[PDB]
Design a protein around this ligand. Structure first.
Ligand SMILES: Nc1ncnc2c1ncn2[C@@H]1O[C@H](COS(=O)(=O)NC(=O)C[C@H](N)c2ccccc2Br)[C@@H](O)[C@H]1O
Ligand SMILES: Nc1ncnc2c1ncn2[C@@H]1O[C@H](COS(=O)(=O)NC(=O)C[C@H](N)c2ccccc2Br)[C@@H](O)[C@H]1O
Lengths: 496, 496
């Protein structure tokens, strides 16, 4: 009685499980005692979860909150939801109770599902509850009764909604279009094992999962408790035979600081992919020199299109390079840089706001048509057609070869001088004893460093940097704090 | 210097010319002395036209008016425009000068192109002019100078704009999604020769072209001057070895009236496809009985998605059948019937307004965001996501098996009784001497018939029909008048 997506219609289920046919006994997951789960065994688990979910009587478009990190069972659940046209809302179990309640209030999901050993204890009676594990999907409280109205699942149906409360609605057509565009780049092969570090609630995790499974490669989910300690992290990558390591730049900071010798021993690592924020070039040059046979790729873009561009870093990174390129949009993507007059920037080295034409565009912000209209805007180069672009909120400029360079959030840019915090941080990272450095503007410029004479550090900055870029104050901190998704927590540093 | 669509990106060029690689010397066109043009020779002509167009310096999204009917040269031009990301605006040369000027005023195209022997003589100086033929694309007046701003062509770029002044903007992604969905139905094979009758300006012509060329079949364009005379029309289908005949129901009316014996001699015809309006069942039963080995398919939908459903008629058509089904939406399409309260209709036999979820959706109405917002509306079953549906303007109901039945335009539906003009016309078509019949409401009910005693014809209606369905007046006419696209011209009949 439940609708199911047809094989010919864009849908995560069919996209990620195609290798169960062409290579059933190849590994889809490697986990640690190292264990593998084949494509065939993954599809079996998806199909068993989907049979159980289909019993609950949910209509296509009914929302399922999936509280999990990246595991074989969580990926089996999101693929079962996919097949049934039930958009999933991934939430990491580290999400505070109040923030989850805020998501439940706005999203009004039919069902909340967590792992058998999950610890969420406080979900409202209107929301159904279930636990998933080895033993199948187990309903605790059934979702409320309803009538199904949707006969057939389409490509524009919602695959997932990313909540940060801002909810980015992605369609199956959009996410599959991003996977097809990156598969065309041959980043990885079926013999790769992709170590993924991002929380499931971050679309960088959903990118890694669909890249690996769509290619017929293996996914090696790195638990947060392994990632947080440098020798433990390196032993996990070695034991699992990871060939590719994906994550935000911060995943390398402890290893580079405490264990560079053991990092250099990861002889099977063929590639590193980072995204979500700038990689400090002194840290990136350190990593590149420890692993000379790992290709490093810089991934750029936003939840609103999943991503935009994937750009191999130069080998070696020029010692005087100020900014890595974010390259050229993927095939089928296009960028216009518009100035503050709404007009195209063609001039080399002049920043404008990225307006993106993408086949992977979000459907809209959940219950926020006004926010949608400010971001998905009429194409400024073709305003009479009805075609929309993503007004990205990002600045960038082009080089002599048409390649892009990211230039910060439009809304987050001293003495009539634009500060480049990356330039301040670069010069402090080059000061003897400084391991890490983050600069921020309260406008007053403070730097936080992981190690000390502040006065010697200021004069060292003043040797190369203009007056407006010299930090007013330099504060020693034990750690650079991170957001749940692994980005620099500048709001936390502002508090001290 | 001109941008060109990449092979991996949805685009008419790559879609329609794939067979130039897999089957270069197979026929793409059959024309009449019967001549063929191979896939390889078509791609050569497209590439030569595209090289010439690329010289003009147009930017992606710049509009090209293509004044032509369906010919190898016109199809080569629309594919050259496709490759360069220049949306084409197809206009039939039968379009009156005033109507073309109205289109030029609103669309503001960069270029107007017509055939070497075309007769349009009055195009404004701001619009560039060119003629295309055997001898290539020939510029008469260059388009105005501009700066190109678009670096890369995407799938959401506009392929064409259909003007009726209402302009339906279609994307390459949308039109290719319709072709892929119909290719999945195996209507035709590469050995088919598809006789196409629609003017190029009607998207039924664009459907036939992409179906044939996407399949690797041959297209047999039927000139209007061959279509208008029944023996001439039948000799053309026989000489060209047509295996499939596509067109609006009116293309059969003269043949059925004057030449049913010769129609029965079309031994190579394996299939008939009609769309755009109801086929009067007495005429459709006549045709089906003359050509018992031709499959007949009923195509339903609107320019706004190109089409929705393709439904083989029953063989034979039940003599008591009142309404042909419009079946089930294609794979990847979905219909909700909503009532006048905006709520889903689940009840068998109750009409509601078709709301369509389609991968082939139009981008919007040209320069009419208000009309766009009244037609591409928030999904009424999922209004908080941002997902849109097509509010079709069509009524339909479902049968016991979930199949649809078209029930007229919502806006165009006597004594507190809904009139079904098809029922009036059916009973008059069954009256001895009546060849054709059209009923219309001025509300006063008039019927126009092609042949006579009006009084005997009224009493014959009154034998089976309720009082409110008996025509007030019956007028003998020589011909049922048609619109340029071949539909019943009810506005013309209203004038008499
Ligand atoms: N390479 C980058 N360099 C510098 N800044 C970057 C970068 N990528 C994102 N950003 C910034 O993050 C913003 C996007 O933040 S986000 O919406 O949370 N998305 C992400 O961080 C991850 C992104 N969706 C993504 C997914 C999959 C693969 C790569 C990437 Br990037 C973007 O608009 C930029 O401001
Ligand atoms: N099969 C049908 N039976 C009865 N009515 C039909 C039918 N198809 C369209 N219509 C009516 O035409 C309307 C659409 O008019 S239109 O926008 O000019 N489109 C067409 O006539 C042709 C349509 N785009 C089409 C293209 C390609 C293949 C099939 C078809 Br149908 C539609 O909304 C219905 O009201």
């Amino acid at each position: 009685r439940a609708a199911r997506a047809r094989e010919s219609v864009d849908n995560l289920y069919w996209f990620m499980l195609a290798a169960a046919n062409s290579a059933p006994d190849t590994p889809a997951f490697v986990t640690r005692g190292v264990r593998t789960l084949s494509y065939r065994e993954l599809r079996t688990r998806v199909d068993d979860f989907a049979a159980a979910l289909a019993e609950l009587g949910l209509d296509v478009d009914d929302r399922v909150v999936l509280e999990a990190n990246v595991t074989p069972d969580a990926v089996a659940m999101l693929l079962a939801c996919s097949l049934l046209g039930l958009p999933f809302i991934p939430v990491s179990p580290e999400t505070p109770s109040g923030r989850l309640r805020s998501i439940l209030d706005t999203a009004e999901p039919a069902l909340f599902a967590q792992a058998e050993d999950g610890g969420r204890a406080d979900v409202p009676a209107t929301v159904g509850t279930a636990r998933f594990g080895a033993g199948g999907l187990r309903v605790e409280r059934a979702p409320r009764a309803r009538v199904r109205h949707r006969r057939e699942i389409v490509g524009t149906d919602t695959a997932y909604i990313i909540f940060t409360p801002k909810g980015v609605v992605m369609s199956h057509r959009s996410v599959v279009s991003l996977y097809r565009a990156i598969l065309e780049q041959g980043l990885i092969t079926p013999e790769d094992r992709i170590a993924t570090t991002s929380p499931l609630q971050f679309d960088f995790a959903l990118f890694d999962i669909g890249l690996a499974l769509g290619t017929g490669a293996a996914l090696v989910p790195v638990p947060r408790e392994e990632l947080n300690w440098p020798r433990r992290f390196l032993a996990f990558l070695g034991d699992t035979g990871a060939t590719q390591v994906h994550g935000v730049p911060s995943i390398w900071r402890p290893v580079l600081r405490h264990e560079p010798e053991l990092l250099a021993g990861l002889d099977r690592v063929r590639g590193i992919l980072f995204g979500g924020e700038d990689f400090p070039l002194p840290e990136l040059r350190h990593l590149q020199g420890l692993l000379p046979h790992a290709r490093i790729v810089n991934g750029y873009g936003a939840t609103e299109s999943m991503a935009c561009s994937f750009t191999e870093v130069p080998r070696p990174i020029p010692s005087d390079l100020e900014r890595l390129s974010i390259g050229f949009p993927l095939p089928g993507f296009d960028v216009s840089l518009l100035d503050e007059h709404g007009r195209p920037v063609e001039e080399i080295g002049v920043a404008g706001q990225i307006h993106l034409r993408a086949p992977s565009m979000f459907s809209g912000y959940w219950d926020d048509p006004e926010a949608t209209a400010r971001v998905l805007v009429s194409d400024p180069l073709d305003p009479r057609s009805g075609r929309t672009v993503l007004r990205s909120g990002d600045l960038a400029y082009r080089g002599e070869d048409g390649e892009l360079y990211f230039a910060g959030r439009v809304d987050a840019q001293i003495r009539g001088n634009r500060v480049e915090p990356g330039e301040v941080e670069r010069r402090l990272l080059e000061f003897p004893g400084i391991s890490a450095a983050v600069a921020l503007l309260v406008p007053v410029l403070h730097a936080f460093v992981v190690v000390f004479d502040k006065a010697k550090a200021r004069a060292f900055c003043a040797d190369t940097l203009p007056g407006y870029m010299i930090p007013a104050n330099i504060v020693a901190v034990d750690d650079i704090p991170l957001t749940v998704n692994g980005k620099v927590d500048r709001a936390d540093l502002a508090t001290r």
